[PDB]
Design a protein around this ligand. Sequence first.
Ligand SMILES: COc1cc2ccccc2cc1-c1[nH]ncc1NC(=O)c1cnn2cccnc12
Length: 275
Amino acid sequence: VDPTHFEKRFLKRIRDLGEGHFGKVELCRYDPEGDNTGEQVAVKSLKPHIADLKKEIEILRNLYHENIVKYKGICTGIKLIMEFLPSGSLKEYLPKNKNKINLKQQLKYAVQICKGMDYLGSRQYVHRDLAARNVLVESEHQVKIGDFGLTKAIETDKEYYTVKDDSPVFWYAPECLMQSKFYIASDVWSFGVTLHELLTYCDSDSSPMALFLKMIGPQMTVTRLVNTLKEGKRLPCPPNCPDEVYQLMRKCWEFQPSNRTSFQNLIEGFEALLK
Ligand SMILES: COc1cc2ccccc2cc1-c1[nH]ncc1NC(=O)c1cnn2cccnc12
């Protein structure tokens, strides 16, 4: 018996967790005993792209880190089976838990995101989609990177991956916008934007999209965004965020990828502030 092979007849749908343009994640119970005692699992599938999901499954199958969502297996068309985290993403959890999550916890979550991300980089992958919606809450003390839908391997001895083919433009570094080039330093830029979200408790009115649209004016959006970044304009300091924290966030946003901070330097910076 292969423990990573989930039989369709025992995989019982409970409800939707979230839906995208091409796929969805559902809460299922794998119940071979048929008495509702089986384990709850998160199941990613496509709407009735297939080749991309198979590449995603093989990426996650080989990633093992305390801050990366656990691969469980497959249901073969194919479905990706993962551990279920009931608290959902930071985007859903943070607005409902402000009283529980203070600055010290936001900085520990920031460290955890950086550790998962530094690990993905050491395995030669560029995430391309780091945003709060992709960071899952295990507990009030732990987060995990929860999706790898856009993840690409960077060729040995190369610095970036060029993407051929709906992009999260308000989280994208200037090289991603202008040349479709994705470096490890591009994920650091996206991390800076995710840190801004975490510090605002994912407030929709001060989302990266809302804030950049106010700067540029509410097919032409991306050109105005690139121009705004070339002028040196950046997302403002979050309310109640100390300047020393905002300075670390600003180091994620150096125009040139080679001038940006590393995830290791960010971890060191946050750990210095936590003392
Ligand atoms: C990362 O979340 C999504 C990714 C998607 C990727 C593609 C399409 C839809 C997606 C929806 C979600 C999502 N939206 N609202 C909550 C959640 N996910 C969880 O609540 C969740 C709970 N354990 N779990 C394990 C793996 C993945 N997701 C989860």
